[PDB]
Write an enzyme that holds these catalytic residues in place. Sequence first.
Site, PDB file in Angstrom:
ATOM      1  N   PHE A 169       5.926  -5.864  19.374  1.00 46.70           N
ATOM      2  CA  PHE A 169       5.610  -7.249  19.664  1.00 46.70           C
ATOM      3  C   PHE A 169       6.888  -7.963  20.072  1.00 46.70           C
ATOM      4  CE2 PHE A 169       2.684  -5.961  16.100  1.00 46.70           C
ATOM      5  CZ  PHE A 169       1.542  -5.827  16.888  1.00 46.70           C
ATOM      6  N   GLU A 205       0.826  -1.194   0.000  1.00 47.81           N
ATOM      7  CA  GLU A 205       0.000   0.000   0.000  1.00 47.81           C
ATOM      8  C   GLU A 205       0.869   1.256   0.000  1.00 47.81           C
ATOM      9  OE1 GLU A 205      -2.426   0.173   3.684  1.00 47.81           O
ATOM     10  OE2 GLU A 205      -0.763  -0.864   4.660  1.00 47.81           O
ATOM     11  N   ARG A 217      -7.312  -9.958  11.400  1.00 49.85           N
ATOM     12  CA  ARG A 217      -7.628  -8.666  11.993  1.00 49.85           C
ATOM     13  C   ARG A 217      -7.719  -8.811  13.492  1.00 49.85           C
ATOM     14  NH1 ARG A 217      -7.986  -4.449   9.444  1.00 49.85           N
ATOM     15  NH2 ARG A 217      -8.972  -3.296  11.156  1.00 49.85           N
ATOM     16  N   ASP A 271      -6.984   2.452   8.314  1.00 50.48           N
ATOM     17  CA  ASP A 271      -7.402   1.301   9.102  1.00 50.48           C
ATOM     18  C   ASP A 271      -7.904   1.817  10.441  1.00 50.48           C
ATOM     19  OD1 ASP A 271      -5.988  -2.020   9.703  1.00 50.48           O
ATOM     20  OD2 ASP A 271      -7.617  -0.998  10.747  1.00 50.48           O
TER      21      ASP A 271
HETATM   22  O1  LIG Z   1      -3.398 -12.615   0.611  1.00 47.50           O
HETATM   23  C1  LIG Z   1      -3.783 -11.450   0.619  1.00 47.50           C
HETATM   24  C2  LIG Z   1      -4.981 -10.965   1.231  1.00 47.50           C
HETATM   25  C3  LIG Z   1      -5.221  -9.651   1.269  1.00 47.50           C
HETATM   26  N1  LIG Z   1      -4.356  -8.723   0.739  1.00 47.50           N
HETATM   27  C4  LIG Z   1      -4.625  -7.276   0.828  1.00 47.50           C
HETATM   28  O2  LIG Z   1      -5.063  -6.974   2.142  1.00 47.50           O
HETATM   29  C5  LIG Z   1      -6.372  -6.347   2.092  1.00 47.50           C
HETATM   30  C6  LIG Z   1      -7.204  -6.824   3.255  1.00 47.50           C
HETATM   31  O3  LIG Z   1      -6.844  -6.118   4.432  1.00 47.50           O
HETATM   32  P1  LIG Z   1      -7.473  -6.505   5.840  1.00 47.50           P
HETATM   33  O4  LIG Z   1      -7.358  -7.975   6.028  1.00 47.50           O
HETATM   34  O5  LIG Z   1      -6.907  -5.588   6.853  1.00 47.50           O
HETATM   35  O6  LIG Z   1      -9.007  -6.141   5.632  1.00 47.50           O
HETATM   36  P2  LIG Z   1      -9.745  -4.730   5.709  1.00 47.50           P
HETATM   37  O7  LIG Z   1      -9.588  -4.446   7.159  1.00 47.50           O
HETATM   38  O8  LIG Z   1      -8.935  -3.900   4.779  1.00 47.50           O
HETATM   39  O9  LIG Z   1     -11.115  -5.095   5.249  1.00 47.50           O
HETATM   40  C7  LIG Z   1      -6.925  -6.703   0.725  1.00 47.50           C
HETATM   41  O10 LIG Z   1      -7.865  -5.715   0.321  1.00 47.50           O
HETATM   42  C8  LIG Z   1      -5.668  -6.718  -0.145  1.00 47.50           C
HETATM   43  O11 LIG Z   1      -5.265  -5.433  -0.582  1.00 47.50           O
HETATM   44  C9  LIG Z   1      -3.188  -9.125   0.111  1.00 47.50           C
HETATM   45  O12 LIG Z   1      -2.403  -8.345  -0.388  1.00 47.50           O
HETATM   46  N2  LIG Z   1      -2.975 -10.476   0.091  1.00 47.50           N
END
Ligand SMILES: O=c1ccn([C@@H]2O[C@H](COP(=O)(O)OP(=O)(O)O)[C@@H](O)[C@H]2O)c(=O)[nH]1
Length: 351
Positions: free
Chosen positions: A72, A22, A191, A100
């Site tokens: 961590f 990102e 998460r 986030d």
């Molecule tokens: O194997 C994976 C899974 C997810 N993503 C990225 O990580 C994001 C998901 O982020 P998160 O799990 O934090 O979810 P959010 O909180 O963004 O819904 C996706 O949109 C992708 O850009 C990635 O690069 N590889």
Amino acid sequence: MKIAIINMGNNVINFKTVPSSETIYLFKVISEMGLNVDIISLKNGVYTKSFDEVDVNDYDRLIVVNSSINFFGGKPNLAILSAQKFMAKYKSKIYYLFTDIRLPFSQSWPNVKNRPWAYLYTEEELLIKSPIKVISQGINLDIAKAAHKKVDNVIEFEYFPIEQYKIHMNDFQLSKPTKKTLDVIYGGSFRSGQRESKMVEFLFDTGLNIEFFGNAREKQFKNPKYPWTKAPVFTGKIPMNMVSEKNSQAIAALIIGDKNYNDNFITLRVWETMASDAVMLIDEEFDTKHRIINDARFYVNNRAELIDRVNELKHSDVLRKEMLSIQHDILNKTRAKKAEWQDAFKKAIDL
Ligand SMILES: O=c1ccn([C@@H]2O[C@H](COP(=O)(O)OP(=O)(O)O)[C@@H](O)[C@H]2O)c(=O)[nH]1
Ligand SMILES: [Mg+2]
């Protein structure tokens, strides 16, 4: 005019990790936006300059990609520490990209003073004093200003759909029809349990062929409040720049978020899904007013409705393509405002 962008708690190198990805994407959108930017990180690389080989004041703008400031384990994290030192010595306003819900800006010193390796740093060295401008991708800035109540120097809050950068990239393109091998798919991390209820609801015990790619692993789902029997297949992580080809592997792709994401954040997965060859199925609670797409067929209120919507798409390829065509058309409508988006971003960082 020179801009510097850095990640606050993660090393930046390639597309193997999400925070690194990102950050490079943000680097790219701003350059393609006609601005001189540099990514500053731990070491020199394909897309970055070294923290200790540059002077923070050579820049007139400093953009910080939000991250966790948690050390961590019992070890110092140079990514966090070096980033805070850099920021600490910058004189002007810092622009904090809040993408986030659980990563608001915050002083790292409180988390360091009590650590055993605290002797390696001084308060003056890590205490970030510059005024902070928080650029939140949440329509209702009040989630951002709530998480930043404990921090003083934060003098500004401004909304801006940051994660729309996936579709405004010059190399971006819509996914093409692809041989289906899955009913539903979802990619992301665990998460740290903040979204277990939603994940179990829409991805577990559906009777469908579902996949949960990303950092999450099965054994992490054990909260007694959200029972399950048959879990989806976990296949591990893949590069962020391979996410749309992955979603395109399924008939439908799930869109869910944290509680405070609801009716506020229109995340990156919304565009990665909307642009894929997978029909986008949004969780009602995530966008109750239907801001993403004004067609109730793209929304599911619970597990039963998901199963139902999918059985429909499986029975009618005519319907599956009609919906793909619709979401693609809506995505193109947001893309046609690229110029308006870039300008809004330039204003955000006081340019
Ligand atoms: O194997 C994976 C899974 C997810 N993503 C990225 O990580 C994001 C998901 O982020 P998160 O799990 O934090 O979810 P959010 O909180 O963004 O819904 C996706 O949109 C992708 O850009 C990635 O690069 N590889
Ligand atoms: Mg995210």
